[PDB]
Design an enzyme around this catalytic site. Sequence first.
Site, PDB file in Angstrom:
ATOM      1  N   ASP A   1      -5.549 -37.130 -22.764  1.00  0.00           N
ATOM      2  CA  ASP A   1      -4.765 -38.895 -22.080  1.00  0.00           C
ATOM      3  C   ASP A   1      -3.625 -38.453 -22.092  1.00  0.00           C
ATOM      4  O   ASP A   1      -2.895 -39.043 -22.708  1.00  0.00           O
ATOM      5  CB  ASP A   1      -5.630 -39.610 -23.246  1.00  0.00           C
TER       6      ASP A   1
ATOM      7  N   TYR B   1       7.191 -37.018 -35.931  1.00  0.00           N
ATOM      8  CA  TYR B   1       7.465 -38.696 -35.602  1.00  0.00           C
ATOM      9  C   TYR B   1       8.147 -37.859 -34.966  1.00  0.00           C
ATOM     10  O   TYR B   1       9.295 -37.339 -34.819  1.00  0.00           O
ATOM     11  CB  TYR B   1       8.519 -39.240 -37.239  1.00  0.00           C
ATOM     12  N   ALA B   2       8.711 -39.351 -34.160  1.00  0.00           N
ATOM     13  CA  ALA B   2       9.190 -38.729 -32.241  1.00  0.00           C
ATOM     14  C   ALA B   2       9.339 -40.346 -32.572  1.00  0.00           C
ATOM     15  O   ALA B   2       9.245 -41.709 -32.051  1.00  0.00           O
ATOM     16  CB  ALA B   2       8.123 -38.475 -31.496  1.00  0.00           C
TER      17      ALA B   2
ATOM     18  N   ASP C   1      -2.009 -37.494 -28.191  1.00  0.00           N
ATOM     19  CA  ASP C   1      -2.995 -38.445 -27.611  1.00  0.00           C
ATOM     20  C   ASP C   1      -4.333 -38.293 -28.956  1.00  0.00           C
ATOM     21  O   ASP C   1      -5.667 -38.734 -29.154  1.00  0.00           O
ATOM     22  CB  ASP C   1      -3.809 -38.150 -26.437  1.00  0.00           C
TER      23      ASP C   1
HETATM   24  C1  LIG Z   1      10.945 -49.885 -30.997  1.00  0.00           C
HETATM   25  N1  LIG Z   1      10.364 -48.934 -31.568  1.00  0.00           N
HETATM   26  C2  LIG Z   1       9.112 -47.886 -30.907  1.00  0.00           C
HETATM   27  O1  LIG Z   1       8.380 -48.260 -30.376  1.00  0.00           O
HETATM   28  C3  LIG Z   1       8.384 -46.598 -32.007  1.00  0.00           C
HETATM   29  C4  LIG Z   1       7.062 -46.303 -31.488  1.00  0.00           C
HETATM   30  C5  LIG Z   1       6.751 -45.302 -32.187  1.00  0.00           C
HETATM   31  C6  LIG Z   1       6.981 -44.240 -32.540  1.00  0.00           C
HETATM   32  N2  LIG Z   1       7.085 -42.960 -33.525  1.00  0.00           N
HETATM   33  C7  LIG Z   1       5.639 -42.117 -32.875  1.00  0.00           C
HETATM   34  N3  LIG Z   1       5.701 -41.053 -33.764  1.00  0.00           N
HETATM   35  C8  LIG Z   1       4.421 -40.150 -33.098  1.00  0.00           C
HETATM   36  C9  LIG Z   1       2.817 -41.051 -33.004  1.00  0.00           C
HETATM   37  C10 LIG Z   1       1.946 -40.442 -32.911  1.00  0.00           C
HETATM   38  C11 LIG Z   1       1.075 -41.778 -32.893  1.00  0.00           C
HETATM   39  C12 LIG Z   1      -0.650 -42.172 -31.784  1.00  0.00           C
HETATM   40  O2  LIG Z   1      -0.903 -41.748 -32.999  1.00  0.00           O
HETATM   41  N4  LIG Z   1       0.060 -42.227 -30.802  1.00  0.00           N
HETATM   42  C13 LIG Z   1      -1.954 -42.235 -30.219  1.00  0.00           C
HETATM   43  C14 LIG Z   1       0.506 -42.340 -29.903  1.00  0.00           C
HETATM   44  N5  LIG Z   1       2.140 -42.543 -31.959  1.00  0.00           N
HETATM   45  C15 LIG Z   1       1.932 -44.275 -31.835  1.00  0.00           C
HETATM   46  C16 LIG Z   1       2.419 -45.218 -32.697  1.00  0.00           C
HETATM   47  C17 LIG Z   1       2.659 -46.370 -31.900  1.00  0.00           C
HETATM   48  C18 LIG Z   1       3.564 -45.731 -30.362  1.00  0.00           C
HETATM   49  C19 LIG Z   1       3.103 -44.192 -30.154  1.00  0.00           C
HETATM   50  C20 LIG Z   1       3.555 -42.426 -32.519  1.00  0.00           C
HETATM   51  N6  LIG Z   1       5.171 -43.176 -32.317  1.00  0.00           N
HETATM   52  N7  LIG Z   1       9.206 -44.397 -32.209  1.00  0.00           N
HETATM   53  C21 LIG Z   1       9.132 -45.329 -32.122  1.00  0.00           C
END
Ligand SMILES: CNC(=O)c1ccc(Nc2ncc3cc(C(=O)N(C)C)n(C4CCCC4)c3n2)nc1
Length: 262
Positions: A130, A86-87, A148
């Site tokens: 990507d 989780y980022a 990606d």
């Molecule tokens: C207002 N807050 C926020 O928008 C917010 C959104 C995501 C977040 N962490 C997260 N951590 C791990 C991630 C792996 C993915 C993924 O499968 N991608 C193909 C990139 N994604 C996506 C999900 C939707 C946006 C990125 C991940 N997103 N933390 C905060």
Amino acid sequence: QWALEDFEIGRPLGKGKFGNVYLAREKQSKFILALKVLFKAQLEKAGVEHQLRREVEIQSHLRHPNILRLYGYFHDATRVYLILEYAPLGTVYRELQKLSKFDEQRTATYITELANALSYCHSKRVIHRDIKPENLLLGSAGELKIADFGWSVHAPSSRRTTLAGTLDYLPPEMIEGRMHDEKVDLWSLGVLCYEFLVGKPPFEANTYQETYKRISRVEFTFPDFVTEGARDLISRLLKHNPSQRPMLREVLEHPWITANSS
Ligand SMILES: CNC(=O)c1ccc(Nc2ncc3cc(C(=O)N(C)C)n(C4CCCC4)c3n2)nc1
């Protein structure tokens, strides 16, 4: 090992053609992670079930501070579950929505982290990530994470579809249907550097067909505020001829990068 029952589920962070990404928590450790759920029906319908198997094995052996880690995976009768790092700070795309555009120090620092990440990938014979900004995430220290893997997903705050953002970053050689090599990643770096400094991608057009022509003919221009060092790096990366694009080590040593990067 893992089953769905090992996790607490929270809100969906985003949704894509193949499934959704949820905030999740592993029950024992209380560690927060991103659970990416892909529906087998969608994977079969698109014929990418074999791609995902291949990419899971690759992602499993990628370990780099600037690449989102895959912790593990599992499946049931209808779904494939990817247990991802989780980022916490969201996408770089959303941070661009907020700031409108990035200064040269932020841009050069990000390009440095990505070039390092891509050099690691290429050493593993992994090419064409990507790296459109919706696929780039910010870790708790603000480091960039290439994310990606498992295909695009869109957050609710997003105004750019899966398809459009990926198209914005495609190199001429893949638009034109020719052979390509790892120089596709140098092209993407040039598009990203421009979108970072300018706030818009360089070949943006009203239709997809016009975008194709703009990419293929490398039709981009710079706003007045782009500095001559930034123009030089972007121009070298956005060469139609892949052989003319720099080596990643030459990006990392470019005078504009070394003058501005953290
Ligand atoms: C207002 N807050 C926020 O928008 C917010 C959104 C995501 C977040 N962490 C997260 N951590 C791990 C991630 C792996 C993915 C993924 O499968 N991608 C193909 C990139 N994604 C996506 C999900 C939707 C946006 C990125 C991940 N997103 N933390 C905060």
